């Protein structure tokens, strides 16, 4: 059973932050509100490894008064430490991205996410609608806009469960994804007890390039802290899925990068698996918000942080 495996193989550890403390935790442990939102153009610090080391040297000349890129997080009425970006209006914490060319790195405060998701956005029952909607779909900056890999920041909280799956007809794939959805939400109800997850209405965002990426909100009112906690969530969802009708956990670590949707090495494009009880344009549109894509995106009073899943 999945109930028994959860009862005997995970040690939930949660702390209930309240009110002002919880709001401070969200704002200081999750990306700034502006970092998510699409912008007319990108502001950031985008360069290869060597030139990035040089820019970091210049910033470390300016602050006295390659994991440091993710570490350069801050607060400020005065602009933060990362403002290396050379723009004052930056807000932290920022997304930090890995790029292939040669390896490049970007620390971005804004981006044109419209141009990233524009080639793959759209204007019966649930299964047929999903199949139909799915059927209906160089320098540092440019090669940024070709591929990007989100870098896991061990200093930020996790708001999206983001699974990388490495697995044939398309009928089988879509039906298997629906069963995957049911199993994963059984797992989520187990792991996240205080939340009312409706097993057939809770969003799972499926992206196919066989290679899949599954993206779920962490249910309110939780956030997840820790690479080990996310590894445990992944283990539980893997077990829940493998104990339901079918026919990677090393990605959660400080500094490890994960290919984002709408980016190539094949391009990750939405595969719409509508929940059985949805009420669907918003689901399709949300497949394009970067807040379903990043580990550390802001969620949408009490906040029960799950910070440990112990066990031998």
């Amino acid at each position: 059973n999945i109930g028994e495996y959860v009862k005997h193989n995970v040690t939930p550890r949660e702390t209930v932050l309240d009110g002002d403390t919880a709001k401070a935790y969200l704002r200081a442990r999750t990306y700034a509100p502006g970092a998510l939102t699409p912008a007319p153009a990108y502001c950031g610090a985008v360069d290869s490894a060597t030139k990035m080391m040089g820019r970091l040297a210049d910033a470390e000349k300016l602050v006295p008064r390659l994991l440091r890129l993710a570490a350069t997080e801050q607060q400020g009425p005065t602009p933060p430490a990362i403002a290396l970006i050379r723009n004052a209006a930056v807000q932290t914490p920022l997304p930090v991205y890995r790029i292939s060319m040669g390896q490049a790195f970007a620390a971005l405060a804004w981006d044109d996410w419209a141009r990233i998701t524009r080639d793959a956005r759209l204007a019966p029952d649930h299964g047929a609608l999903g199949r139909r909607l799915t059927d209906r779909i160089l320098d540092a900056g440019g090669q940024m806009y070709v591929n990007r890999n989100e870098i896991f920041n061990g200093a930020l909280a996790i708001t999206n469960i983001i699974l990388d799956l490495d697995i044939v007809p398309f009928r089988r794939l879509h039906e298997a994804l629906g069963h995957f959805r049911r199993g994963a939400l059984a797992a989520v109800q187990l792991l996240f007890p205080a939340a009312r997850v409706d097993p057939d209405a809770y969003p799972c965002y499926f992206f196919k390039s066989i290679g899949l990426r599954v993206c779920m909100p962490v249910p309110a009112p939780y956030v997840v802290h820790g690479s080990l906690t996310m590894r445990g969530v992944a283990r539980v969802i893997q077990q829940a899925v493998l104990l339901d009708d079918f026919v990677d956990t090393g990605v959660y670590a400080h500094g490890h990068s994960l290919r984002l949707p709408y980016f190539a090495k094949g391009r990750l494009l939405p595969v719409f698996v509508i929940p059985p009880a949805c009420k669907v344009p918003a689901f399709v549109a949300a497949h394009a918000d970067p807040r379903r894509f990043h580990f550390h995106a802001p969620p949408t009073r009490e906040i029960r942080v799950l910070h440990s899943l112990g066990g031998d």
């Binding site: 702390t15 309240d18 430490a81």
Partner: protein, 717 residues
């Protein structure tokens, strides 16, 4: 025939020091008095005093100092250097010896006090000073000093100076570097504004050796350049002294945080060079002392003028600074305990004081050791309540006993005793005196350990009589030291008027018994003992030797002692410790107490998260004596801020590396502060307190441990 005038000495300054012909054991000092008549018009007076090698050694504390050493140390002030940090003890000893010789060879001098001054017209020096019969003194007038100087020391020079002495305070490194290359002060920038009651003086300088960019006022309206010809006896020729006589003010006043010592050293150095560039006179001594002239620094801020310009300056409270200047002849804090006796005279006095005591307290002095138990204490961890608990203090007892035993051993040269006695009498009424004594008594006992031994023995006698009387006045001394002690009564915890009666009767009985015992040991007191009831309490809990918390269950008043207060975070920690102890002892087992204690710790850590980026909040003060983690040369580029570092170094831990918050400009930009480290230290203190409370009120051996790795570490790591 000597001419007498009713004057008042505004300041006593050291002008010249030399050695007369064919002299090898005694030197001479020419001392400059800034005096003022009733009308306040300043006049300049001089005196010549003689010091032998034995007096210098006695005021030095050892036989290392030579008269030839003082001669070269005082000729070396050509005013480009900063000599008194080559040997600060030398200069303190020389200043104290000259003042003692001046009081011994010319008369009882007193700053800001009516004196009759008589001088010899043939020689020109003041020959005898006496205490004037009558006359209202002139009012000591102040001037407001603002002095800011930008001095370009190479940071690697400071790096090397600190590398030679790892615990060096960086103000001392700044001054040592200025001493190495004095031109740094000449080619520095300086803005100075001096506001007296008459006009405003102001100068702004780009190179302090070049004409001012900004001028406002003349330099002849602050001061007056006086040439006075003197004939120092036993020396060949007439010699002319050129002095500055401050019109309508007697001392400067400088603010606390803005105070910079190299700024004033450079400013006075330029004043000295300007005034004494004209030939045909004598160049004064250029000497300054302060906490910043010792490698390990010094706790109390000041800087004393020994020589040019000739008048004080206060790094401030202004009334108290003036009173401490006047009552101590201006030698404190400059000379230290030398303002009472020469250190080499403290052994004998101690011996004499020992010889005059009753044999029992004689043996108690003979055997005294710091850890020796004296009375029936409470042996922590312990808890009392609901009882009537009282705290008592003998306010100022150690200073009183030091003064008394000094006058007892006076059979071992006593104006210092008179100053100490006036301080003791003044402490009950004006707090500058008590604040002085708090530093003076430990420094005196640091001069000689026999004094520690004597004073601890007499304190043991006081403790023994307190216990004896406590037995008979319904009192059990549960803890304390002897000058402050707390205990409990055998009176009904419900009758409060009876309580107050018993407290008062016990207070009178103990005061009488201690006074009688000190009197029988011939230890006479300069003002009679007062036993202060610090407070009445109902419960008390003791967890360490000095860790104790008192609660009064009827008006909800507490007192906490033994809890470290080394930062704002520890202040908040103390606050929550007292709140949670209020709740815990109002709960009248261990389970509910632990629940309340963990709630307190959790709430503490959340509120700490709300201050997760405040550098000043989480910074702890490290003393020159604890180990301190160094920092790369970046702190060595702080500049002027390095000078306001004489005792304490505030340090944060960021992500773990230390940061001296005060050495860098503002706003600080830092990685997130390592709140985990700081909270771990704070919680270690809190667990000591809580473990003691649990073991005292309920006898549980299960210590209080608050799990931090689990449960609320994730917020920071």
């Amino acid at each position: 025939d000597i001419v007498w005038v009713e004057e008042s000495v505004s300041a006593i300054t050291l002008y010249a020091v030399w050695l007369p012909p064919r002299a090898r054991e005694y030197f001479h000092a020419l001392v400059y008095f800034v005096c003022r008549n009733a009308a306040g018009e300043g006049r300049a007076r001089f005196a010549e005093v003689s010091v032998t090698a034995t007096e210098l050694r006695d005021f030095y504390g050892s036989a290392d100092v030579a008269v030839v050493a003082a001669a070269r140390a005082a000729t070396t002030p050509a005013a480009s250097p900063l000599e008194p940090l080559e040997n600060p003890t030398l200069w303190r000893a020389l200043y104290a010896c000259v003042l003692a010789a001046l009081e011994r060879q010319t008369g009882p001098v007193a700053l800001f006090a009516p004196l009759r001054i008589g001088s010899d017209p043939r020689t020109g020096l003041v020959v005898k000073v006496e205490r004037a019969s009558w006359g209202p003194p002139a009012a000591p007038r102040a001037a407001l000093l603002v002095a800011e100087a930008n001095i370009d020391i190479d940071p690697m020079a400071l790096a090397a100076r600190v590398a030679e002495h790892p615990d060096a305070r960086l103000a001392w490194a700044r001054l040592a570097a200025i001493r190495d290359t004095p031109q740094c002060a000449s080619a520095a920038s300086l803005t100075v504004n001096i506001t007296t009651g008459t006009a405003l003086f102001a100068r702004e300088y780009q190179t302090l050796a070049f004409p001012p960019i900004k001028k406002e006022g003349a330099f002849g309206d602050l001061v007056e350049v006086c040439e006075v010809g003197l004939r120092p006896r036993g020396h060949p020729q007439r010699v002319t002294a050129r002095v500055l006589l401050p019109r309508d003010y007697d001392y400067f006043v400088s603010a606390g945080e803005k105070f910079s010592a190299p700024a004033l050293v450079a400013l006075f150095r330029q004043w000295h060079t300007t005034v004494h560039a004209a030939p045909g006179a004598l160049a004064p001594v250029f000497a300054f002392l302060g906490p910043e002239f010792e490698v390990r620094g010094g706790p109390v801020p000041y800087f004393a003028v020994l020589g040019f310009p000739g008048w004080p300056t206060f790094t401030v409270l202004v009334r108290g600074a003036a009173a401490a200047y006047a009552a101590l002849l201006g030698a404190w804090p400059a000379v230290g305990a030398r303002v009472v006796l020469p250190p080499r005279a403290w052994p004998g006095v101690a011996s004499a004081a020992a010889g005059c005591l009753l044999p029992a307290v004689r043996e108690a002095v003979a055997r005294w050791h710091p850890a020796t138990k004296i009375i029936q204490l409470l042996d922590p961890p312990a808890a009392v309540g609901p009882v009537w608990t009282a705290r008592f203090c003998f306010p100022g007892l150690r200073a009183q006993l030091l003064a008394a035993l000094a006058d007892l051993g006076g059979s071992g040269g006593r104006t210092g005793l008179a100053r100490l006695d006036a301080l003791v009498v003044a402490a009950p009424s004006e707090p500058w005196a008590g604040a002085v004594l708090e530093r003076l008594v430990p420094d005196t006992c640091n001069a000689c350990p026999a004094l520690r031994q004597l004073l601890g023995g007499v304190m043991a006698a006081v403790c023994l009589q307190i216990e004896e009387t406590a037995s008979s006045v319904k009192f059990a001394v549960c803890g304390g030291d002897g000058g402050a002690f707390w205990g409990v009564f055998n009176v009904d915890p419900q009758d409060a008027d009876a309580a107050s009666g018993v407290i008062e009767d016990a207070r009178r009985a103990i005061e009488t018994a201690v006074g009688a015992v000190l009197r029988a040991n011939a230890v006479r007191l300069r003002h009679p003992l007062c036993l202060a009831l610090e407070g009445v309490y109902t419960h008390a809990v003791a967890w360490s030797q000095a860790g104790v918390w008192f609660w009064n269950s009827r008006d909800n008043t507490d007192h906490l002692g033994g809890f470290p207060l080394r930062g704002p975070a520890y202040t908040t920690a103390a606050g929550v410790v007292r709140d949670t102890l209020r709740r815990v002892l109002g709960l009248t087992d261990a389970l509910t107490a632990r629940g309340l204690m963990e709630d307190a710790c959790d709430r503490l850590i959340l509120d700490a998260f709300n201050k997760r980026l405040d550098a000043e909040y989480w910074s702890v003060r490290v003393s020159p004596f604890e180990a301190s983690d160094p920092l790369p040369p970046t702190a060595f580029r702080g500049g002027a801020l390095l000078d306001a570092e004489h005792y304490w170094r505030r340090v944060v831990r960021v992500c773990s590396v230390g940061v001296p918050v005060d050495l860098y400009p503002r706003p600080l930009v830092l990685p997130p502060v390592d709140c985990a480290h700081h909270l771990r230290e704070i919680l270690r203190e809190i667990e000591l307190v809580f473990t003691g409370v649990l073991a005292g009120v309920w006898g549980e051996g299960g210590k209080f441990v608050y799990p931090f790795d689990d449960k609320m570490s994730f917020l920071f790591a």
